[PDB]
């Protein structure tokens, strides 16, 4: 009866050629955990915490220089009310996987200075699982908040498996079981990241080209969750990303797997078109939820240039 949609395109420059970006909202502001690992005679590996200011990315800290890691780690960032918890884990090759996992933890309560200490998850739960980096937040389960590190099986029991920490990332002793009955043999999962919205657990992952899949989980008992596929398939459109605005899903799509244009659907009703022809596509377009009625759609059309679409959506019946 009353629907409002407002979109704003903007451009942010970046002096660092990040291999991968990792956006996060802290105190209503945009940040990025930038991995800089460009191969060269004088190029070193860095992991920068950056902050979007005006039309630029401001480099604040380099977390890698405070660690002992030689190469690219798995980054798991957990954001609370005013806290930031970043873990840089050693990417151990499947064949040469040792029984314990060494991570370098970082804690901050201002978004400026970080305490750092190396941690070791002894006899860790995800030895037989593949990990992928993501930004996340607390999940409340038995009147208790947990950070989650989830892995996936490569290709009979527990394809998805999570490690949890109720002490702000100090110890990863807790084991959260995930029951996905539509698991398949002969297929592989990739880039599995949990999507947490209003204390509901969901997962965004690739299946394989690779196709995005989205599952919705419900808490069964103890630390077990039962998940089922959430169909977002659209004919002549390729599923890209899922987020929630106004207690409803907002879903992004590509025209084909080349991503000349991107479509954003609101509650599977209204849609907006993202055409990357103002300056070259929308590959890797990712949602960044700011609040219940505000969110961002970010992609990098060219090297160092960030197209940030700011989306406002509401129903005022």
């Amino acid at each position: 009866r009353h629907v409002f949609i407002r979109t704003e395109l903007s451009f942010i420059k970046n002096n660092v050629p990040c291999i991968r970006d990792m956006f996060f909202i802290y105190k209503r502001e945009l940040y990025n955990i930038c991995l800089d690992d460009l191969k060269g005679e004088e190029d070193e590996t860095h992991i920068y915490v950056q902050k979007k200011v005006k039309d630029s990315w401001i480099t604040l800290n380099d977390l890698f220089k405070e660690t002992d890691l030689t190469g690219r780690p798995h980054i798991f960032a957990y954001v609370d009310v005013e806290e930031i918890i970043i873990l840089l884990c050693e990417d151990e090759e499947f064949s040469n996987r040792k029984k314990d996992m060494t991570c370098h933890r970082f804690y901050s309560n201002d978004g400026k200075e970080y305490n750092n200490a190396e941690i070791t998850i002894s006899d860790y739960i995800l030895k037989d699982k593949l990990l992928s980096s993501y930004v996340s937040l607390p999940l409340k389960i038995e009147n208790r908040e947990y950070f989650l590190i989830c892995g996936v099986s490569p290709y009979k029991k527990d394809d998805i498996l999570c490690m949890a920490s109720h002490d702000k990332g100090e110890t990863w002793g807790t084991k959260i079981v995930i029951k996905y009955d539509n698991y398949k043999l002969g297929v592989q999962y990739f880039f599995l990241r949990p999507y947490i919205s209003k204390n509901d657990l969901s997962f965004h992952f690739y299946v394989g080209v690779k196709n995005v899949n989205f599952i919705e989980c419900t808490h069964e008992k103890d630390l077990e969750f039962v998940c089922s596929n959430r169909d977002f398939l659209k004919d002549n459109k390729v599923l890209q990303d899922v987020s929630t605005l106004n207690d409803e899903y907002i879903v992004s799509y590509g025209n084909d797997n080349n991503f000349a244009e991107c479509y954003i659907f609101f509650n599977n009703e209204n849609s907006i078109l993202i055409k990357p022809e103002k300056y070259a596509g929308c590959y890797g377009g990712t949602f960044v939820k700011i609040d219940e009625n505000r969110a961002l759609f970010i992609y990098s059309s060219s090297q160092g240039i960030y197209n940030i679409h700011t989306i406002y959506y509401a129903n005022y019946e």
Partner: antibody, heavy 126, light 103 residues
Framework: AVTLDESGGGLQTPGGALSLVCKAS????????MGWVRQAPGKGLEYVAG????????LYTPAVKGRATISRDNGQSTVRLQLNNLRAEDTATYFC???????????????????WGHGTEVIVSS | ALTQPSSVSANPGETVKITCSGS???YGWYQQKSPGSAPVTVI????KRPSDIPSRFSGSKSGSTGTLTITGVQAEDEAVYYC?????????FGAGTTLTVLR
């Protein structure tokens, strides 16, 4: 019985190049980080070059940075050190070393060595 | 830099402590009885002892310091020990600490 047999050293021409080779055995070569450590006459141990278990990461001492290449053949259980444009400062005993880890952390290279080669003298002289 | 004493002296039977500082990461301890003669890892990975090394040898790490401890030091332990570790993303060794056991 871990064994680290070093070769390719001795008298070298100043300005020329060397090719140290360490043939390993008695362990799973592909799992560990390997490296070279040298000891100059009357000086202590200096770490020369290091290489990850899968050869995807290398490191070099500033004294050799620009004129060195550490490579490995996990199939032949070999680690090679090439040292171009040799100086009298590179005259030392060189030792092949096996780390107790993959080389995913800098302390694996010089803080986790669990096997040392007998050493090979290299004299850079005219 | 990685810092360890230049020398440490002990009478046979005593407990010996050599400290190395400058790194918050994993310490290694290498015994060399003669220059050019190959080192022998006494302790690696802070407190791991190779099976063929005597049980008197122990390792420890507190803060940004690693400590080699020889309990009931023997005359044969007289040798120069080098600590090994990373020093701010640089692979490194200390200058050596020459121990003398007064037989």
């Amino acid at each position: 019985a871990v064994t680290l047999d070093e070769s390719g050293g001795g008298l070298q021409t100043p300005g020329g190049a060397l090719s140290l080779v360490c043939k390993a055995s008695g362990f799973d070569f592909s799992s560990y980080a390997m490296g070279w450590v040298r000891q100059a006459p009357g000086k202590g141990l200096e770490y020369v070059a290091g290489i990850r278990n899968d050869g995807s990461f290398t490191l070099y001492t500033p004294a050799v940075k620009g004129r060195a290449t550490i490579s490995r053949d996990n199939g032949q259980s070999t680690v090679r050190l090439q040292l171009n444009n040799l100086r009298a400062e590179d005259t030392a005993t060189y030792f092949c070393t096996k780390s107790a880890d993959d080389g995913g952390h800098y302390s694996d290279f010089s803080g986790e060595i669990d096997a040392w080669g007998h050493g090979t003298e290299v004299i850079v002289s005219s | 830099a990685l810092t360890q004493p230049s020398s440490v002296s002990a009478n046979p039977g005593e407990t010996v402590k050599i400290t190395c500082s400058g790194s918050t990461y994993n310490y290694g301890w290498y015994q060399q009885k003669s220059p050019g003669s190959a080192p022998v890892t006494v302790i690696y990975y802070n407190d791991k002892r190779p099976s063929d090394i005597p049980s008197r040898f122990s390792g420890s790490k507190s803060g940004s310091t690693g400590t080699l401890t020889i309990t009931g030091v023997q005359a044969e332990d007289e040798a120069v020990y080098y600590c090994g570790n990373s020093d701010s993303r640089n692979v490194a060794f200390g200058a050596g600490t020459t121990l003398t056991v007064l037989r």
